Amino acid sequence: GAMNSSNYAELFNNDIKLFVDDTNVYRVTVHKTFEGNVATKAINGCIFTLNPKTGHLFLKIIHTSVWAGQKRLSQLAKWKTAEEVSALVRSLPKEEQPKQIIVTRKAMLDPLEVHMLDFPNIAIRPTELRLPFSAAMSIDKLSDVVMKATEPQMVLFNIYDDWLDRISSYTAFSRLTLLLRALKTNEESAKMILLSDPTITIKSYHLWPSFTDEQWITIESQMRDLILTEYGRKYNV
């Protein structure tokens, strides 16, 4: 059934699984019309599909042309997400196809289940965790490739850079979700923390900076301060 705190180590076992997050698929700016009415303008989006064990990110870019002439876009976006996930699975070799797919929002269950009827042995699961994957567009290089797309495109990343050389996938996922939770609660502060020291760079082939183990503990600590901070600035505590 649903994925929660109690079965959390299941993410890092050897059964292939994927998280699918659809928050950033349908993205709009809301603005005023010359006549003083309101209108939306779509911008490029992305499906965030992630193997939590390996760090492999299948970033399907959703170009605004896919909404042209379509109605009820928020609903369509869930079915479009499900169509693209199903296409991704069929494109993988059998031994690489996931055994489970965990959706971060329950409204993706039925669309994905229907698109995956051909794969009755792939379990489609919800989760009770409040995962911060919406903040993926606060990662500069991911945001940059989505916004520059002129056509539908799939781009492959490792969201853990080279971390798994030094840490386990449980620890790497915990670092990722802490970075993303921080970027989500206070993006400016989060990014200040990450780039404050000009001597620590982001390698061309990476998404995050090249921190030593000690600098990662400093960084991780600063992000927890931010999240507690903002949690006080918010609730006044």
């Binding site: 369509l76 079915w79 499900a82 169509e83 039925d110 669309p111 289940e113 229907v114 698109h115 009827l117 051909d118």
Partner: peptide, 16 residues
């Protein structure tokens, strides 16, 4: 309602 009999390949959203 979530069966291949009920859902035409390629008409997933339409047929559901």
């Amino acid at each position: 309602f979530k069966s291949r009999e009920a859902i035409r390949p390629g008409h997933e959203m339409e047929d559901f």
